[PDB]
Amino acid sequence: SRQRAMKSATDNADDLIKALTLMANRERQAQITQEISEIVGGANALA
Amino acid sequence: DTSGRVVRVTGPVVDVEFPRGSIPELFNALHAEITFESLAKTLTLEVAQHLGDNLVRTISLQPTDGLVRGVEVIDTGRSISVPVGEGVKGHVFNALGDCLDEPGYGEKFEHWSIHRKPPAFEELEPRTEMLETGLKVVDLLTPYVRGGKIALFGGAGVGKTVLIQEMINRIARNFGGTSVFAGVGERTREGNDLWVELAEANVLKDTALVFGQMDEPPGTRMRVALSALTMAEWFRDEQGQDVLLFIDNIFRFTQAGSEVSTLLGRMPSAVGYQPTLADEMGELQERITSTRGRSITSMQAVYVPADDYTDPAPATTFAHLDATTELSRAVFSKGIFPAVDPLASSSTILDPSVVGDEHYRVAQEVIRILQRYKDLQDIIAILGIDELSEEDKQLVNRARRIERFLSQNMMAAEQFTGQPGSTVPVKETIEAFDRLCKGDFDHVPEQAFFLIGGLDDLAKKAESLGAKL
Amino acid sequence: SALTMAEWFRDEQGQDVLLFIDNIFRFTQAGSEVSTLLGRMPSAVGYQPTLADEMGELQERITSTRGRSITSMQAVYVPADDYTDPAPATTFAHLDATTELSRAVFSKGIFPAVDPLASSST
Amino acid sequence: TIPADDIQSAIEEYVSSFTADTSREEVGTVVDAGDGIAHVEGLPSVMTQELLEFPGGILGVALNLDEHSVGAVILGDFENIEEGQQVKRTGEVLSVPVGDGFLGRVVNPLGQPIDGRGDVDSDTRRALELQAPSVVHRQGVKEPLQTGIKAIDAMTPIGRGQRQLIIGDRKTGKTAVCVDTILNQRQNWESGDPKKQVRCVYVAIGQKGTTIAAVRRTLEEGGAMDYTTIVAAAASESAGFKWLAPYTGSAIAQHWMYEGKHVLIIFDDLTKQAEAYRAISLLLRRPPGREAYPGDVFYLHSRLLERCAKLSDDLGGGSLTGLPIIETKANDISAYIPTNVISITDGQCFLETDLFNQGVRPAINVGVSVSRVGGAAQIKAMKEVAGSLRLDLSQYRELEAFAAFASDLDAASKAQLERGARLVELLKQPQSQPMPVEEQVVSIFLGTGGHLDSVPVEDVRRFETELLDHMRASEEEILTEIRDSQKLTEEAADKLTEVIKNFKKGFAATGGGSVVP
Amino acid sequence: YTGSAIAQHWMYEGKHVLIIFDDLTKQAEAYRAISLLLRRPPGREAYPGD
Ligand SMILES: Nc1ncnc2c1ncn2[C@@H]1O[C@H](COP(=O)(O)OP(=O)(O)OP(=O)(O)O)[C@@H](O)[C@H]1O
Ligand SMILES: [Mg+2]
What string of DSSP letters covers D57-110?
Answer: S-EEEEEEE-SS-EEEEE-S-GGG--TT-EEEEEEEE-EEEESGGGTT-EE-TT
B262: contact with D, CB 8 A cutoff: yes
C-alpha B198/C-alpha B412 separation (Å) is: 10
Contact B345/B299 with Cβ under 8 angstroms?
Answer: no
Rounded to 10 deg, the angle between the B160-173 and B188-200 helix axes is 50
Q: Whose CA is nearest to atom 5 of ligand 1?
A: D431
In angstroms, rounded to a whole number, what is the distance separating the alpha carbons of residues D144 and D154?
A: 11
Nearest-CA residue for atom 6 of ligand 1: D431
E40 secondary structure, DSSP code: P
Residue A46 CA to its chain's centroid (Å): 33
Q: From residue C26, give the alpha-carbon distance in Å to each of A42, C23, C77, C79.
A: 22, 6, 8, 11
Contact between D245 and D273 under an 8 Å Cβ cutoff? The reply is yes
- Residue B218 in contact with residue B260, Cβ under 8 Å? yes
Distance CA D503, CA D470 (A): 8
Q: How far is A32 from chain D (nearest CA, A)?
A: 7
Tell me which amino acid residue D2 is.
I
- Coil, strand, or helix at residue C44? coil
Determine A/E contact with 3+ CB pairs under 8 A as the test. yes
Closest ligand 1 atom number to CA of residue D174: 21
Q: With CA atoms as reference, report the closest residue to D295 among B219, C72, C121, B136.
A: B219
Single-letter residue type at D503:
F
H helical segments located in chain C: 2-8, 26-33, 51-59, 86-91, 103-106
- The angstrom resolution of this structure is 2.8
From ligand 2's centre to the CA of C44, what distance in Å? 23
Say if residue D456 is preceded by a cis peptide, omega within 30 of 0: no
Tally the residues of chain C.
122
How many CA within 13 A on the CB side of residue B268?
Answer: 32
CA D380 to chain centre: 25
Give the chain D residue nearest A32 (alpha carbons). D290
Which of D360, D305, D350 lies closest to D327 in space, CA to CA? D350
DSSP count for chain D of H helices, then E strands:
18, 16
Per DSSP bridges, beta strands D106-107 and D70-74 are unpaired
DSSP label at residue D40: E
**Preferred mutation among D32, D78, D114, D170 to probe C, highest tally of C CBs within 10 A:** D170
- Is B310–A32 a contact, with Cβ atoms under 8 angstroms apart? no
- Residue B75 to residue B32: CA distance in whole angstroms: 9
Centre a 10 Å sphere on the Cβ of residue E37 and count the other Cβ atoms it contains: 8
How many C-beta neighbours within 10 Å does residue D8 have?
A: 10
* Alpha-carbon gap, residue D146 to D181, rounded angstroms: 7
**Which of D203, E46, B284 has the alpha carbon at shortest distance from A35?**
E46
Three-state secondary structure readout of D311-357: ECHHHCCCEEEEEEEEECCCCCCCCHHHHHHHHHCCEEEEECHHHHH
> Residues E5, E6, E7, E9: is their CA dihedral positive or negative?
positive
User: What DSSP string runs through D356-411?
Assistant: HHTT-SS-B-TTT-EESSGGGGS-HHHHHHSHHHHHHHHHHHHHGGGTT-GGGS-H
Please state, in angstroms and rounded to a whole number, the distance separating the CA atoms of residues B7 and D127.
Answer: 25
Which amino acid appears at position B65 of this protein?
Answer: D
Tell me, in angstroms, the distance from the centre of ligand 1 to residue C22's CA: 28
User: Ligand 1: which of D152, D169, D174, D202 to mutate, most ligand atoms within 8 Å of CB?
Assistant: D174
Asked whether at least 3 C-beta pairs link B and C within 8 Å, the reply is no
Residue of A28, A31, A38 to mutate, interface with C, max C Cβ within 10 Å: A38
Question: How far apart are the C-alpha atoms of C37 and C55, rounded to whole Å?
Answer: 19
CA angle B146, B150, B152 (to 5 degrees): 150
Which among A38, A45, A46 has CB closest to E44? A38
- Measuring CA to CA, which residue among D373, D376, D374, D367 is closest to residue D395? D367
**DSSP strand pairing (D59-65 vs D50-53):** antiparallel
Q: What is the DSSP string of B411-433?
A: GGGHHHH-PPPP---HHHHHHHH
D288 CB neighbours in chain A (<8 A) are 39-40, 43
Which amino acid belongs to residue D126? R
Cβ contacts of C16 within 8 Å, gap of 6 or more: C69, C71
Are the CB atoms for D315 and D306 separated by under 8 Å? Answer: no
Residue C3 Cα to ligand 1 midpoint, Å, equals 30
Experimentally determined by? cryo-EM
Residues of C contacting chain A (CB within 8 angstroms):
36, 39-46
The whole-angstrom separation of Cα B34 and Cα B155 is 40
Task: Examine residue B83 and say whether the peptide bond preceding it is cis (omega within 30 degrees of 0).
Answer: no
Query: How many angstroms does the Cα of residue D343 sit away from the middle of ligand 2?
Result: 22
- Separation CA D467–CA D209 (nearest Å): 41
CB contact under 8 A, A45 and E46: no
Q: Distance between CA atoms of D351 and D338, rounded to whole angstroms?
A: 13
Query: Which residues of E lie closer than 8 Å to C, measured between beta carbons?
Result: 40-41, 43-44, 49-50
Cβ contact D–A (≥3 pairs, < 8 Å): yes
Residue located nearest, by CA, to atom 14 of ligand 1: D171
Measured in Å, residue D175 CA sits from the centre of ligand 2 at 4
Could you give the CA distance from residue D181 to residue D213 in angstroms, rounded to a whole number?
A: 18
Question: Do the annotations mark residue D206 as ligand-binding?
Answer: no
* Nearest-by-CA chain E residue for C42: E43
Whether residue B399 contacts residue B372, with contact meaning beta carbons closer than 8 Å, is answered with yes
Smallest Cβ–Cβ distance between D67 and the set B7, B382, B383 belongs to B7
Contact indicator for D164, D373 with CB cutoff of 8 Å: no
CA distance B1 to B22: 10
> d(Cα C102, Cα C81) in Å, to the nearest integer?
8
CB < 8 Å to A45, chain C: 36
Q: What residues have CB less than 8 Å from D226, skipping those under 6 apart?
A: D103, D104, D189
Return contacts of B136-139, CB within 8 angstroms, 24+ apart.
B136/B405, B136/B406, B136/B408, B136/B424, B136/B429, B136/B432, B136/B433, B137/B338, B137/B340, B137/B342, B137/B345, B137/B406, B137/B407, B137/B408, B138/B325, B138/B340, B139/B424, B139/B426, B139/B429
Q: Are D424 and D458 in contact (CB under 8 A)?
A: no
D40/D20 Cα distance (integer angstroms): 25
Measured distance CA(D423)–CA(D404) in Å, rounded: 18
Cα–Cα nearest to B233, from B210, B265, B259: B210
Please state the atom number of ligand 1 nearest to the C-alpha of residue D211. Answer: 27
Cβ neighbours around A10 below 10 Å, total: 10
Residues in chain D: 517
Residues touching ligand 1 (Cβ under 6 Å) are C 122; D 168, 170-176, 361-362, 429-431
Spatial neighbors of A26 by CB under 8 A, at least 6 apart, are B310
Quick check: A42 and E39 CB within 8 A? no
Contact B39 D129 (CB under 8 A): yes
Task: Give the count of beta carbons closer than 10 Å to the beta carbon of residue D63.
Answer: 22
Alpha helices in E1-50 (DSSP H): 2-11, 24-37
Taking contacts as CB-CB distances below 8 angstroms, the residues of chain A near E39 are 45
Q: Which ligand is nearest to the CA of D362?
A: 1
Do D48 and D61 meet the contact criterion of CB atoms below 8 Å apart?
Answer: no
Please list the active-site residues of B: 160, 186-187
Taking a C-beta distance cutoff of 8 angstroms, is the pair D207, D246 a contact?
no
